[PDB]
Design a binder for this molecule. Structure first.
Ligand SMILES: [Ca+2]
Lengths: 208, 210
């Protein structure tokens, strides 16, 4: 089966967890404490000195988007053909871009930078509304007619931004409905309601 | 009439790797050059999905994000590993390359003067993982993943080339990466491209720094 190794936070594992839960997959959580991380030995063994670390049998992976793409490819959550796969990547790279900005805010410039960030947020979310508007009237998924790993990543991005800036999706009807619809998928709904998700902080420094 | 079009500023930047890939694979493409003046006018930018270039056209398929373009070409040209496991390793390498490219770009555009010394001191620790990956793959005598070239090779190669300009001799501490750069750079179609005016007469970055 699968093992994800990570700090006790949602962070860069939230999306891959939602994917695994929604897809009825089983996995083991190996929690790494701040104390264990500071010891240095685990960190030194990681390829890029970072978690998450992910095990799929004898395969060991690092990088959250590498793990998402791997599950996407192996579980068939990567579009119906090559053309759709490229669109899936384009969405995910866009999600990753905004996630990086979010992470920079949270960890390095929260107090001073929040106001500018929130003011800029509508312009950063609009591309995803536009993409939805151009795919079956936004009624299905972010790419094509089937769920992809980019959907789970985008959903997480949107959920953590509603916490950061309540009402940020109010001007975006397709994104709003999309969040409601995906969140209502029975296995995902169950996971999002579970203490396993709810009782972890979004980030590691108490800010959100 | 070529099926590929690259729309970008007159710089190597985030299009260098994908151009190397296309040239080395003997594929034809069109370059559409966007001046800073045109970009500042704002209408092209507004038409871009995330407000940025590169924009890439493969027939009527329009893509943005340089790594989206690399993965797409990797898929369509068979440069994405021999199986699913290798595909994942290729992704893991490319994400690593992207991470270091982001720090590089931040240095170049955001604080070259203040940050360069610190960056160059941190650099060996940042390059080591790629040496390690090479050491674990056939003694580093072929490619970064498996025994066939991947899009991650072209991206890593570009990363290494631009860091040798930033920090001459930075690869002296990394025998496998050094040999790897020499070896890939000598691939006939790629060697020819890297020597051509089309590559040489473009600056690495958009602000005169390297
Ligand atoms: Ca499917």
């Amino acid at each position: 089966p699968y093992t994800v190794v990570y700090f006790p936070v949602r962070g860069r594992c939230a999306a891959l967890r939602m994917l695994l839960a929604d897809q009825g997959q089983s996995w083991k959580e190996e929690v790494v404490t701040v104390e264990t991380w500071q010891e240095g030995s685990l960190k030194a063994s990681c390829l890029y000195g970072q978690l998450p670390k992910f095990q799929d049998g004898d395969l060991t992976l690092y990088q959250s988007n590498t793990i998402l793409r791997h599950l996407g490819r192996t579980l068939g959550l990567y579009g119906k053909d090559q053309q759709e796969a490229a669109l899936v990547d384009m969405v995910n790279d866009g999600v990753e871009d905004l996630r990086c900005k979010y992470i920079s805010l949270i960890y390095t410039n929260y107090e001073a930078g929040k106001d500018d960030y929130v003011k800029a947020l509508p312009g950063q979310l609009k591309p995803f509304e536009t993409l939805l508007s151009q795919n079956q009237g936004g009624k299905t998924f972010i790419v094509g007619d089937q769920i992809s790993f980019a959907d789970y990543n985008l959903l997480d991005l949107l959920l953590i931004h509603e916490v950061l800036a309540p009402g940020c999706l109010d001007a975006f009807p397709l994104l709003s409905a999309y969040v409601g619809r995906l969140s209502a998928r029975p296995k995902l709904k169950a996971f999002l309601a579970s203490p396993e998700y709810v009782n972890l902080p979004i980030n590691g420094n108490g800010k959100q």
